[PDB]
């Protein structure tokens, strides 16, 4: 069903994210883990993004999406929802598009390319294709590991979810 197709697609993308393998003297590039995009970077068609989209009824979400085009005439992207049920190709300003990392940072070689404990991030919430505010609880220790995060969640008395796992592909700066 659609649920399964979606979750499978998310796994595929998380798992296929290449590990950055430098040699002595190299630094992790832009979009390796937590290293931000260069100033005035523009994502390429096919690249995955978090995209701030307003529904017809006004609800704003950061959704998982893919760049379709960028117009230098208007400085706007087109992006497509990675969910087939999202039938609208969205036009967005650069401020509504955050490139996802193109490399996984290896905690054993480039730990400065990971988010620090208690950093505020946007992270994809389990069983969804959307990003929400969270604090880093634990970084990955090994290249296969997920982040552990605490989502802001007003259904808890302290305002945070328990530790939930999110892959490096799906954690970006807030």
């Amino acid at each position: 069903g659609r649920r399964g197709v979606l979750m499978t697609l998310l796994q595929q993308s998380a798992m296929t994210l290449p590990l950055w393998i430098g040699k002595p003297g190299d630094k992790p590039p832009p979009l390796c883990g937590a290293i931000p995009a260069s100033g005035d970077y523009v994502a390429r068609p096919g690249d995955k993004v978090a995209a701030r989209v307003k529904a017809v009824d006004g609800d704003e979400q950061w959704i998982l999406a893919e760049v379709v085009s960028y117009s230098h005439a208007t400085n706007k992207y087109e992006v497509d929802d990675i969910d087939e049920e999202g039938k609208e190709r969205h036009t967005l300003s650069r401020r509504r598009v955050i490139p996802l990392p193109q490399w996984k940072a290896n905690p054993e070689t480039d730990p400065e390319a990971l988010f620090q404990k208690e950093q505020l991030v946007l992270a994809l919430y389990p069983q969804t294709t959307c990003f929400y505010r969270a604090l880093i609880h634990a970084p990955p220790q090994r290249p296969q590991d997920d982040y552990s995060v605490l989502f802001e969640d007003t259904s808890y008395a302290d305002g945070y979810s328990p530790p939930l796992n999110v892959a490096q592909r799906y954690v970006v700066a807030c």
Partner: peptide, 8 residues
Amino acid sequence: ARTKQTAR
């Protein structure tokens, strides 16, 4: 998209 509100 699949939202948290839908998910929960």
